[PDB]
Amino acid sequence: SVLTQPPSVSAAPGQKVTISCSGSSSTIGNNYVSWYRLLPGTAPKLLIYKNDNRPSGIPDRFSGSKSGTSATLGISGLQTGDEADYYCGTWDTSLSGGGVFGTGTKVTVLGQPKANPTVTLFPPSSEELQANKATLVCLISDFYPGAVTVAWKADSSPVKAGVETTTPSKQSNNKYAASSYLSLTPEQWKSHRSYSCQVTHEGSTVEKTVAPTECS
């Protein structure tokens, strides 16, 4: 049920990028792959279907291919209007449910210097704890390209439940920011030695840690 894509790909205007889509033989191996572009305030748009066919009106700088368990979209002549989120998709007719879409890739057309994020991890405020709630707040700012991956740990173990992360938003200085929240009970917060927010951006991961027993 998971078609895996890289979260971010980028290049200068005029260059070529490729986006991979990885799955298994049950999905990609046996079935046709499609590719879509979406951009807020527009209808999604089909770029490729049946692995490598372009629908009418799609120019030949878009290409598609598939081999084994992975498929690939290529975009050459990259231009500003290509900045969008891209999704692969397939439909395994041998199961009763519908089709599946990939995890998504932000394509950035590089127009400014890359910037590594500043990460600030706030523990639950004493005020919120007194209200019988506990939210860890991971604020991520001043990065470019505007795509990050965020993961949380309790002690050394990954946490999936209770996590909400916002889509990166443009700042007034034209870099990007994002936020992630881990919602816990006050018991859970006090029950562990530490919690960590891990932010991955362009080949670097920055991890911040807080602890109920320490003044961060």
């Binding site: 209808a43 999604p44 089709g99 599946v100 706030f122 405020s125 707040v137 604020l139 916002t166 889509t167």
Partner: protein, 233 residues
């Protein structure tokens, strides 16, 4: 040209039902399968339902089986999505989409089901929440207790549990604008929204300058001013 237009979206309480409609024009409607696909803010694309040209063959995304029904009326170029037993987690933009179809092995084969959509609508938004209008609770995000010398420090406010959108936030009544960022909201499983606002300031100022986040929630006629101060430890 080919076009597709959804309607029927709105705000609805959990448990209740809602019917979306999609009208198509500019192509022979009965030669193509149609589908509904949804996307929740900050999340990916999810297949909801799919129906063959003749209306006989249907399928559904796992998350909506036995609660949603798709149908079409070929005499009216309309596809419907009947949504029953709605949950907060059904909150999403719902797209109607046209299957690309295929030819007979060039003539159009109405029995085609490719599962690739070459025409999508702009979508209709559905929000599911049990909440009445409710003002926020504002909590401080206090600067690090280690910012005791120079450099800069991030501080903020966490604006929790309000409905409906939107909230706006300023700092020090608008005196402070540089280095301010207010984030998009997140919908919680409760059906209430939360967001954060942050400002980065000189560490040397933390002992001398007061910082207050001003939250405005017009739907409930509420404003909150929350002083964000250094921690005692």
């Amino acid at each position: 040209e080919v076009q597709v237009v959804e309607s029927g979206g709105g705000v609805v309480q959990p448990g209740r039902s809602l019917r979306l409609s999609c009208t198509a024009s500019g192509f022979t409607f009965s030669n193509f399968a149609m589908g509904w696909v949804r996307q929740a803010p900050g999340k990916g694309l999810e297949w909801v339902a799919f129906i063959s040209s003749d209306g006989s063959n249907k399928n559904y995304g796992d998350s909506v089986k036995g609660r949603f029904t798709i149908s079409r009326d070929n005499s009216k170029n309309t596809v419907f999505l009947q949504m029953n037993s709605l949950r907060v987690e059904d909150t999403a933009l719902y797209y109607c989409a046209k299957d690309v179809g295929d030819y007979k092995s060039p003539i159009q084969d109405p029995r085609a089901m490719v599962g690739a959509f070459d025409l999508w609508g702009q979508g209709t938004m559905v929000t599911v929440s049990p909440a009445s209008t409710k003002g926020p609770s504002v909590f401080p995000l206090a600067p690090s207790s280690k910012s005791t010398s120079g450099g800069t420090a991030a501080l903020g406010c966490l604006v929790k549990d309000y409905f409906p959108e939107p909230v706006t936030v300023s700092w020090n009544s608008g005196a402070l604008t540089s280095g301010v960022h207010t984030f998009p909201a997140v919908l919680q499983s409760s059906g209430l929204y939360s967001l954060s606002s942050v400002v980065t300031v000189p560490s040397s100022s933390l002992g001398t300058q007061t910082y207050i986040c001003n939250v405005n929630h017009k739907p409930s006629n509420t404003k909150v001013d929350k002083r964000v101060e250094p921690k005692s430890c």
